[PDB]
Design an enzyme around this catalytic site. Structure first.
Site, short mmCIF file in Angstrom:
data_model
loop_
_atom_site.label_atom_id
_atom_site.label_comp_id
_atom_site.label_asym_id
_atom_site.label_seq_id
_atom_site.Cartn_x
_atom_site.Cartn_y
_atom_site.Cartn_z
N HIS A 64 0.82 -1.19 0.00
CA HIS A 64 0.00 0.00 0.00
C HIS A 64 0.85 1.24 0.00
O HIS A 64 1.95 1.28 0.58
CB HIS A 64 -1.06 0.12 1.16
CG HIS A 64 -1.80 -1.11 1.58
ND1 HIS A 64 -1.53 -1.74 2.80
CD2 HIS A 64 -2.80 -1.81 0.97
CE1 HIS A 64 -2.34 -2.80 2.90
NE2 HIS A 64 -3.12 -2.87 1.81
N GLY B 265 0.11 -5.20 1.31
CA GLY B 265 -0.88 -5.18 0.22
C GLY B 265 -0.43 -5.99 -1.01
O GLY B 265 -1.25 -6.67 -1.65
N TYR C 32 -7.33 -4.43 8.92
CA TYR C 32 -7.58 -5.02 7.59
C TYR C 32 -9.03 -5.47 7.43
O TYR C 32 -9.68 -5.86 8.38
CB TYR C 32 -6.62 -6.18 7.36
CG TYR C 32 -5.97 -6.19 6.00
CD1 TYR C 32 -4.88 -5.36 5.73
CD2 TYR C 32 -6.44 -7.05 5.01
CE1 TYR C 32 -4.26 -5.36 4.48
CE2 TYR C 32 -5.82 -7.07 3.76
CZ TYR C 32 -4.73 -6.23 3.50
OH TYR C 32 -4.11 -6.24 2.27
#
Ligand code: NI
Lengths: 256, 250, 253
Positions: free
Chosen positions: A66, A105, A135
């Site tokens: 991410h 991610g 998450y």
């Protein structure tokens, strides 16, 4: 035909989508993900039978995961959410060809793919606990179809990296090879698959997807989890984790 | 007490069902399957505690597989094997192909010779495998592995099969029979009723991946599309015509 | 805090819950389980980030498991597995010695399992003719595959720590001399992570893990079968044989 953030090549019936986002270490930014998605979409033709996802040859970092800077960050329409969905629903097999370290991610991203072939030097890590991120259910679900519960729990709770050998041992990876043979090994398999019945592969893949998603619950349970997630998003620890990340310093979690 | 396509031998509480259809490589024909099922049914008695399925000693090919409605032979046998109140161990010697692989997967335990090999092959013929069938192949090895197995239709060794979770044990061929029998006899000393209920609980949990009618109908639509495709025709053809198919995506 | 059946020590942000019932091989008695639960409960504080469950150093037997429908919602084993699963902190089972029956389900319900290279494990309901419950069985299927699970349960044979690792049950196998240190270090490490994140993910995992649903008829049907087992001759035989320490003789009724 061309993209700012990915480079694509077609070899017979196989298509290779190579990342072109090195400055950020291939972090999953919207512009980046959008190009990956356009590319996939553009490749959804009868003549294309198998896709390979990869980072440029010699990459130290396969993907940083991410893009924090860009920051509920894991809502339905967020990039990572969109890509995993697309990859899973794509009627052609998608193989992640891994060279370099995989993070958070990006780890979920490759798990969502059909097969994972990696270099003996690659490494894997699931890191939401490092930043204090709650998450999402779908996201977590995507990490439970290969290795067992205890193993998954160790990866997530420790956020520690695992070798490719271990990743292979626990069921995460399909094959591990010497970096110099990676491309060759992966392509052979891709071409092989490309000789099979595409329509059958498509249906089976979707059957697997549907069965894999088939862990059902009632609305109250989903709303309850969601409430917990919100509480995490609203915590001090959450702010502390992001800052520390941005601040490039060790976070100090306090449980609130 | 006797069958055309199978041979049964009972050793105290253990029953061994041996295929007897080698001329056709133990292909999953209706006739064969019908005998397998009859033999199983006849063995559903209190004094029988454990079943062993096997191919004749020395077999090169365990089963070639096919020769997918609810009542098709393969669908029938997997269901039966799964609902059978006694444990069923697949003792494998030789190569395993297609429908035969699902069949052994549906069984309780798989013990195989160090030389045996396994392949799922629906993608070779353009077959739109059914949901239940695919489900049967997802309880032992991980998703990525299953996808490789299925997408490549490539054979795997007994050692890899063991490593990925498909097999319980791998042994030298010379020791196969005895290793299997001993394990069977041991299970036979255990509480049969308890075994039965636990097996059934596992069965129900295993099937418990639920979905709505629309999703089901949607997959069914996709499957139909496959059966109606050119590629499908090309697949059956090439098999018959013993030549490599040329798939085109239509 | 203090308990009769277990001992507790905190090291920084980690808490170690040690069994103190060796006289009875740490069998899963109600009084034993009650203590465990209370200890967990007392430890449900922000300053505690990770839990370690263990038997005393050197134990030959980790836990004998069950002590003489015993698998009802409120039975001790049923209660403790739920507790462990719902506990918002990671719970690591650190194993030394042999693991049996209910104790095996108990450790399976925990988050991670780290064990000595000499430890062993057995699922034994079939030894006694017990009709295990659905939740219980379910708890044993999230790590190793179906075929493997069925072998363990159907044979009730023990397996080595090496094999437990290979099939996915264990996280790590280590030499006894290093068991403790290896375990603690990981626990300490976990303790530096975001507790709130950990808790939500653990709960998401739990909910997903339980999410195998069925209709009322199926459940009642299973219950009916379970009841038939409980009412069988074989059920009596299994319990008696165990008490009389003689080989049970099962007949199928
Ligand atoms: Ni499931």
């Amino acid at each position: 035909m061309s993209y700012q953030y990915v480079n694509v090549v077609t070899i017979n019936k196989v298509a290779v989508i190579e990342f072109n986002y090195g400055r950020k270490l291939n972090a999953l930014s919207k512009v980046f993900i959008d190009d990956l998605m356009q590319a996939l979409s553009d490749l959804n033709r009868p003549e294309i039978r198998c896709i390979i996802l990869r980072a440029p040859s010699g990459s130290k970092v396969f993907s940083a995961g991410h893009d924090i800077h860009e920051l509920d960050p894991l809502s339905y329409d967020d990039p990572l959410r969109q890509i995993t969905r697309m990859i899973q629903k794509f009627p052609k097999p998608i193989i992640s060809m891994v060279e370099g370290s995989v993070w958070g991610g990006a780890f979920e991203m490759i798990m969502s793919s059909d097969l994972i072939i990696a270099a003996s030097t690659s490494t894997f890590s699931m890191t939401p606990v490092n930043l204090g991120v709650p998450y999402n259910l779908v996201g977590i679900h995507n990490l439970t179809r290969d290795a067992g519960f205890h193993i998954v729990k160790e990866l997530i709770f420790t956020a520690s990296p695992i070798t490719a050998q271990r990743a292979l041992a626990v069921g995460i990876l399909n094959h591990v090879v010497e970096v110099e043979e990676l491309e060759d090994f992966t392509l052979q398999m891709a071409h092989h698959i490309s000789e099979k019945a595409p329509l059958a592969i498509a249906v089976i893949k979707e059957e697997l997807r549907v069965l894999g998603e088939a862990h059902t619950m009632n609305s109250d349970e989903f709303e309850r989890i969601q409430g917990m997630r919100r509480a995490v998003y609203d915590s001090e620890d959450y702010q502390e984790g992001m800052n520390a990340f941005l601040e490039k310093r060790k976070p100090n979690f306090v449980g609130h």
